[model samples]
Target: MIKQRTLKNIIRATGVGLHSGEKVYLTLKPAPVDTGIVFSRTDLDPVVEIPARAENVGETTMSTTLVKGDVKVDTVEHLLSAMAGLGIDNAYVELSASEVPIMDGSAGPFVFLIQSAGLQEQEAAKKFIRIKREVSVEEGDKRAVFVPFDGFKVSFEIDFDHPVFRTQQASVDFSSTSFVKEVSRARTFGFMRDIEYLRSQNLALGGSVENAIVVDENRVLNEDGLRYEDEFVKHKILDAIGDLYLLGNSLIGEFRGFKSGHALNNQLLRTLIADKDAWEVVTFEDARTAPISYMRP
Candidate 1:
């Protein structure tokens, strides 16, 4: 329950793409009242602005990619995660390449950048997608569901054959502060076999222990250990937060994910929006009247 927010000052980051491995520059500038999060490809001859919405999500390969015709931006989830966690409503992302730099392979650096830039509260009331009925999507054994909840809540369960993920499951009541302390530092992870195969195919060229938790058989290759005890599972929650932000607004509902990925998360949002009776766009003029504290300043 709060007003819309944007960056108080422009922020910039330099990093290498997780897949492209190319050094890229990312800049965030404040937008007006309801601009949402739009990514602009500054490297293009004629800059292409692609809104970070599920409708524009083109690929769910190794990362989420936003496509507009032939133009596209890849690996957008982490940046989106930071913005959502900070309760941002309007901002523009300027990218120097097709992908956002996989900064430390976690939302931590992005969260730091946003915090340093500070936040600007807009006069307009922030909107929230409120679930009125249960909405769910499933593919094979994977599934994602949205149910009516007075406040925002997100839960995820990850089942992996690896020894590291023996107990990879977590839930968060969902708030900006909680996101910062609990989920932002959780880094993405991958197996050695997949990394080798992806490298051969010119994918995940930038992925290394520097940016991700490299899992080799049953042990973690990261010497520093984990940022959180359940980091592997928490990263999934981080990804879902970013993916769900593609709803164009913060959600005032409960999201449950079971062995789901970017594809399933997008499908869940699509399913929820397709049913008019299942959801509604709502706003709270007063913070006291808002059912949730997720979108606070």
Candidate 2:
């Protein structure tokens, strides 16, 4: 059987929050079967628990943020992608602040942390949201779509006028792709002008070459250069993986994105959920029927 899984031990890390610029400490702990991924803010007078679900998502402009009452957890995509990439089913993420640390601006560090803690299979069968039909969302020229597919896969196209990001595209069939090698290392990138404006707004205060790939009109500002020729589009795929994981379970479908970001991604998820006929929940009780290739750790 393709069983559910969780971390075998606890792990912790510290870094600066991408938006808040405040130092934050994060703790990852194992959870029982069916618990799902939940975030707990320990800094409040009375701790607040926010389940990482689509309904709890409060914002998605520059990053995905989850809210429950007055509590919030920001910039969760990279970590969520790591969890999804590692095939983690249930875990308790305890945070000392409102945002998860932006370690190296990629999911690679989170993947390393999860692997260091180790993973253990649970008794329950793994669940997947199997798409039954095509579901899509559009915002102006941007759009995202999910269609029924026997395996998990993603393809993205990004159109930027800047020389650094001009019509880059990437496709990854998770069945054979290495999340860590192909996706996790791709860092979030931004133009120098945008970073300057964002800084003036007191946002992205912690952004720097140490965390993100800063670029100018002519070239990438980071001395080391791009991790992959199509890193920009690959990073979009990474973000999509995490945003899609908000369904609170793995999915079996093909996702296609075109100039789409967090907002459109979440909208497509909502669209898929609202149209009940678009998808169905299923479990793999027999290994032969399961799309195991997409769940590599």
Candidate 3:
């Protein structure tokens, strides 16, 4: 049977928070079967718990933020995407600060961490949220859509007047093992002008060429250039992968996004859950018969 998975051992790392510009240490520990993904703020006096669920999402301006009362966790998409991509079902993430570290501004580092720690399958069968009908959400020109499909697939289109983003588009079927090689390494990006403005506002303080792909009016400012020809759109797909994990399980469906960001993605999840007829939770009895294949590494 396709079983739930989690880290076999504890893993830890330290880096700078993207928005806070403060050093943060994070630890990943295994959780019991069906525990799902939970984030703990260890720095708080009484400790705060934030379950990575759609209802707990409090903000989505530039990043996905999960809030529980006065406690908040920011920029969670990359790590979450890593967890989902690897089919991690239960984990306890402990952090020293409100924001996860902006390590390379991609899920690649987190993927490496997970693989290095190894995955252990639990006794319980894996759970999947199967889409039952077409569900769509929009914000002006941006929109996200989820449709019933046997396997998980994602297609994304990004539009920007900047020359760098003029022709970026990508689609991927998660059942393939190409997620690590093709999607995880696509770093987050921003125009130089926008980065400057965000910095002036004291946001994205930890952003740099080392952590993100920075582009100017005419071309990429990073000396090495892009990791993939269409890294810009691919990163959006990566973000969507992370955002959708808030559903608390791997999904079985087709997701299409048109310039959609965290807010629209979260809205789509909320909309899907609000309509009880739109989705149902299912468990795979056998890996061979499963429509979607989650990567084992």
Candidate 4:
């Protein structure tokens, strides 16, 4: 079994946040066992700390925002998703802005930063929340489901009106190569028409073709084009992984998503927690034997 892991050393990087449009610097530091993932506002006087768990989530409309008392961390799904997929248990994420930088509008940059920091094995055993029964949540045609299994698995189907992403589907076993090589690098995309609307609300402030895939009419505007033919849905899977990680434990279950976003994703967690029989905290000694989905690179 994979042991609980933290960072072997500290690392930092600077970039522009996708929504705040501010140049921000973020640092990753190792944390003691059982701390889970935490965000600290280094720019604040007392350095407020917010746990990256589900209860701290206050807003999920545009991005994952964790709040407590008064402190907040924005656009955390991408970064958190990377940490979850890699089986990381503890780390301290310090950022200078309300939002983490949206490098390339994908988890790729954040994944790179975490991997670059290296890994440290702690003495504590990694605790996983094993699904004992199924739990689901729905909003209109969107839905998210968690079924009993072992190891983390994700299967998602996304439908966009865009000609290219109308029915793209992707699945990641998360324990294999598919996640690191394929799903991890896919960039986030946005519609060209929504720019004014999002900007009017003072969001997606730093987004552009350079950092995001801009699609309009029939195709993507970025000259480089799509990294994967179905990059849109893949990015959704990335978001799903991040949003679900707020459960604060490695999920031993089969997670399914159909046209779901952060809101529906968070709702699924609430539903699972609402019923004690739906899930339980357990350890996995053999993940390969679990009834989880498997994907190829």
Candidate 5:
């Protein structure tokens, strides 16, 4: 099997939260080989640590949040997606704020941070969860499915009333280079109408045209427009990559989501977890033998 990995050095960043509109501090530090990704909060009286796993996901209406005891980390998908894409097996995400900073509202900053810190391969072998039997979850018209596949792949389709998302669908095969060059730059979107509604509930207070693609009903308010033609769909793919990563290890399979959101994605993970027979633990004796080339270069 390929070796487990962590950051070679610690990296830090500061920014404002999308929901709180408050300053936040973030630190990514290397962890022990078997520790996996952990969310640690230093702001609390007693430090709280929550391992990255689907079972810990809570309050995912608009973002993927992790909750343990009375502590919670909100909007974690972007950073998590970066770690997953880079094949990070163990690290600690130390936060001084409840929500991760909304840096450019995309995975780009996190991707950069991990690269700056560099990747350190551990002596322990890396592991992956490969699904041999298909597992699917549905919520009304929204659907998520993971089928048996030799490598990691994603196919997603989204439907929204907005003209921008009439029929936004996209797919990609997993690779470290592709994720950095393609999916990581895709930013999240925020509509002006939802801003007021979300702000009333003390959310989206920090959302501005600077961090997210602002949509004014039928038009995009951002000056430069989208980085990609199907950026909206690619953003969804980025979120799905992060959400699926809650598994605490890399996944080996194909995922197809139809109008799927955070909750449905988590449910599908939980469903696959419930049936042990559906998934098998795997590793490659040689990195070249791995089904997908996701190692950080």
Candidate 6:
């Protein structure tokens, strides 16, 4: 059986939020079995715990934002991606700001953080969402698809309509160690054209060459350009991991995305979960050896 899991100890870190620009300290602590992934705002007068489930998601445009009544947590993709990548089943993340820290705009930092905190197997069986049939969604040229696969995989194609993007195609077959080492470390990238709009909305305040790979018309701006030459598309997969994290269970399937973003990804999940014909709840006994456990630690 795939064992349940969580952080071995409480671990903490502080950084500037990517969107809110507020200083935030985040803590990851172990949780009881079946507790699910949760987020709590310790900064509030009365702390708020928001279950990190699809239903708890309030916004999907910027990042996987979760909310419970009056309290909200923004830019949760990196942290969520870390949990998914490491196969963590239950955890409670307590934070002191509105947005999760940018952590260099990649899931790598959280990956390191969780590794440092250590991982432990719990006593319960792991749960999963087994894909029973193809479920897909499309918006213009963008698409996200899920099909039955005993193991997990992701095929991504990005089109930037620019010289730089024309050369990128990032794909991952998580059934091996390649994806974790090659894809998860790729940092998120933003466009020069979009920065102005993001700033007008009072967002992306902590963004810079140090945090993200900012790009212009024909080239990436940072002196240290990209960890992965295909970092742009790779980060989409990172975002997909986070958006899919809210599925409430790990998935056993192959995911195909064509220029998809958080909103489309969330919509795809909502559709699949709402349709009884697409998937079923399941339990497993192992993490690394399970057929579709490629995305796990």
Q: Would you estimate the TM-scores of all the predictions? A: 0.97, 0.97, 0.98, 0.93, 0.96, 0.94
Report the Cα lDDT for candidate 6: 0.83
- Model-by-model lDDT, in order? 0.89, 0.89, 0.90, 0.82, 0.87, 0.83
Per-residue lDDT of candidate 4, residues 149-208 (tens digit): 556678999877667564488777765544668788878888877877899899888898
For each candidate, how many residue pairs have backbone atoms clashing (under 3 Å)? 0, 0, 0, 0, 2, 5
How many clashes in candidate 4? 0
- Best lDDT goes to which candidate? 3
Task: Give me the runs in candidate 5 sitting further than 4 Å from their true place.
Answer: 175-177, 295-297
Off by over 4 Å in 4: 284-297
RMSD of 3: 1.1
Error of 2 at 273 (Å): 1.0
Candidate 4: what lDDT? 0.82
RMSD of each predicted structure: 1.4, 1.3, 1.1, 2.8, 1.4, 1.9
Residue 138 Cα positional deviation in candidate 1, in Å, after optimal superposition: 0.8
Q: What is the lDDT of residue 1 in candidate 4?
A: 44
| Candidate 6 residue runs with Cα over 4 Å from true position | 285-289, 293-297
Tens-place lDDT per residue, model 1, 1-297, is 488999999999999999999999999999999899999999998999998998899955677899999888998999999998888999999999988999889999999888987899998989999999999998999989998998887899988877767557888887434789889999999898998899899999888888999998888989997888899889999999999999989999999999999988888888887899999999897887676675334
Q: Which pairs clash inside model 5?
A: 1-284, 1-285
- For model 5, residues 1-297, the per-residue Cα lDDT tens digits are 588889999999999888888788899999998898999888877888998899899965878999996688988898999998898989999889898899998999898888977899898988999989989998799999999888888899988888766339888887433788879999999888888789888889778888899998888989999889999988999999999899888899989999988989899988999999999888888877678875444
